[PDB]
Design a protein around this ligand. Structure first.
Ligand SMILES: C[C@@H]1O[C@@H](O[C@@H]2[C@@H](O[C@H]3O[C@H](CO)[C@H](O)[C@H](O)[C@H]3O)[C@@H](O)[C@@H](CO)O[C@@H]2O)[C@@H](O)[C@H](O)[C@@H]1O
Ligand SMILES: C[C@@H]1O[C@@H](O[C@@H]2[C@@H](O[C@H]3O[C@H](CO)[C@H](O)[C@H](O)[C@H]3O)[C@@H](O)[C@@H](CO)O[C@@H]2O)[C@@H](O)[C@H](O)[C@@H]1O
Lengths: 315, 309
């Protein structure tokens, strides 16, 4: 049985699996009322990707496809419909057992980024090269027009004209447009992948502590804002590098819970211990919300597989 | 400890020189430029070199603070920005690196988004705008702790506030935009010599050429299909760093394999300093099945003759 392992990466060497951001801090929120059921950064300890999770850091909250036409929408700005393919360019097959194309955003909000295009057709007078354009864009994942599971979504631009129809289109995520009341940011509310009133399917399961005194431990990143007030954050269950490592290794899970220790490599001392659960998430024995204030060199080290009776030392 | 590569297809790899997926393997034997990129540089035994760091989010990224609006012959509105290390600590120019880790390693107009989250609050004000960084500019001096960027936005950039640059692509590949993926920036400005560089790479055996992992990079406007070629994908850099397997010779013989058929499509030399050569006498993409990946075979020496592609 191939021994289970985690990568040896400090917090400053990790990135978020739910948005293209570095990990900033470890974080807890024991009194969170929402169901925690994110779809990116989901991977079992034996290497099975789940939900909309894929391996590319560049694929997280990215879209690839083609603009079909400019469309009408009551909201401010100029709106565009785009078909979306799989990130590798092959057509998305809605009959596949996934909630949506892999990489699709897994939260409600106004995702800010850049739409870019490189035309298929080339111009002889320009050295047989294609024309290009890029503009800021916003994707409202709560919108009834956000239907990635159906193979198309809508984005808005400040730019009123310079977006071409029928041309290869890329969305590069940068942050959020706003976290105002009317922008509906909620990192734990899933989009309706097939549109309003439809049930999401093939979801990675919800996660939660089962043991008294325990709470979820998150890898937190702060996400940029186009404007307005706020310090929004995105919490993932495991960094993208862990997803990548677990997938590579595919080590058999020898129980439902792996005991891991957060270690200071300088002192060698254990800062705290955590349970790493089979489905791919952490719990700690902590009675407070907020950042885990720990030396920058710290990293999780796999200790052993434990049983249903193991009690964590309080943080 | 045995040397290994990750098991990742081209469609599971990302570029180490710009935040892009790998699109194709690529050769260009007649390239006249010296190849000495500084991102995606890692020895086979796990030593990061040049400006290479581990984060996919750190490649061609900057962190720092805007000092003031400035003037420049380039089009747009210009801003000077001090830069720190990506982890926020002050950049110490006396450290043995060419520039802050993550700094772009090529000449061009790098297009992206500058965003700011104010220090003062009880929530801070924010703003983001499109931005261009001309890495060939005399004002591009990251090794001295500051750079200049331009915006279309004429006013809404705050001085003395934490500032992030998220790269997206290139602004242009016109003649006046000086895109050359193999021309290093002058990290300390005009007239100063770059220091602490990752070494240049080249085949040392006849009949061989460099093999690149190629990504196509977005353009803000204009005509072109620009690409960025890296020596090893970011996942390999991350893997080699993790593993730190001793290099048992100067050349690791690797085979590009079809996992379905089990067949070897071609073989390559993976050199100790972290780059590939193949025996190929043509330029362009390597047309290979999507399931293919490199597998370590054995250590050989520099005189080993590769099977022609
Ligand atoms: C808090 C405030 O957020 C951002 O301002 C936006 C407004 O943005 C518009 O105005 C600003 C200049 O005031 C700038 O020209 C920007 O490009 C433009 O879109 C606007 O969205 C309003 C809508 O109610 O909210 C905010 O005031 C930012 O630009 C400001 O610097 C500041 O951080
Ligand atoms: C090839 C061409 O590239 C891009 O156009 C730019 C020009 O951009 C300006 O005009 C376009 C619409 O023509 C758009 O309004 C854009 O926002 C604006 O900056 C301009 O920079 C010229 C220089 O004279 O270079 C390019 O032609 C692109 O926007 C076009 O769609 C088209 O692909």
């Amino acid at each position: 049985s191939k021994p289970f392992t985690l990568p040896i990466l400090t917090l400053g060497e990790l990135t978020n699996s739910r948005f293209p951001l570095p990990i900033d801090v470890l974080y807890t929120n024991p009194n969170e009322s929402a169901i925690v059921q994110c779809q990116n950064g989901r991977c079992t300890l034996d290497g099975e990707l789940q939900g909309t999770t894929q391996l590319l850091p560049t694929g997280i909250c990215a879209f690839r496809g083609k603009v079909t036409q400019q469309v009408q929408d009551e909201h401010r700005g100029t709106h565009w419909n785009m078909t979306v393919t799989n990130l590798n360019g092959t057509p998305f097959d809605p009959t596949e057992d996934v909630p949506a194309p892999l990489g699709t955003p897994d939260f409600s909000g106004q995702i800010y980024g850049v739409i870019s295009q490189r035309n298929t057709n080339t111009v002889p007078g320009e050295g047989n090269l294609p024309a290009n354009r890029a503009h800021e864009a916003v994707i409202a994942t709560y919108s009834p027009k956000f239907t990635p599971k159906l193979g198309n979504i809508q984005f808005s631009t400040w730019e009123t004209q310079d977006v071409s129809s029928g041309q290869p289109t890329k969305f590069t995520p940068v942050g959020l447009a706003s976290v105002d009341a009317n922008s509906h940011f909620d990192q734990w509310t899933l989009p309706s992948y097939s549109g309003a009133l439809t049930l999401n399917m093939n979801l990675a399961p919800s996660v939660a502590p089962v043991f008294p005194g325990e709470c979820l431990l998150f890898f937190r990143s702060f996400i940029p804002l186009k404007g307005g007030y706020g310090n929004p954050a995105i919490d993932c269950l495991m960094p993208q590098e862990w997803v990548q490592h677990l997938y590579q290794e595919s080590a058999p899970s020898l129980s439902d819970v792996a005991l891991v220790r957060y270690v200071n490599p300088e002192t060698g001392r254990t800062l705290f211990e955590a349970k790493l659960h089979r489905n791919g998430f952490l719990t700690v024995a902590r009675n407070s919300a907020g950042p885990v204030v720990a030396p920058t060199n710290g990293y999780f080290r796999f200790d052993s597989w434990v049983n249903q009776f193991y009690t964590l030392a309080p943080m």
